[PDB]
């Protein structure tokens, strides 16, 4: 069944690729270990 596996793979590469859009998200995961930009 490697046809069948072998597409878990597929979706997984395309996943990463999708970095630009991974960005935005990424971004608040770092805003919330510093929000002193904010009190200021």
């Known amino acids: ?3 069948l596996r072998a597409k ?3 979706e997984r ?3 990463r690729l ?3 859009q ?3 998200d990424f ?3 770092e805003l919330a270990l510093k ?3 904010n009190r200021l």
């Open 8 to 10: 878990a793979a597929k």
């Open 13 to 15: 590469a395309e996943r």
């Open 22 to 24: 991974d960005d935005i």
């Open 18 to 20: 999708q970095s630009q």
């Open 27 to 29: 971004k608040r995961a």
């Open 1 to 3: 069944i490697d046809v």
């Open 35 to 37: 929000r002193a930009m």
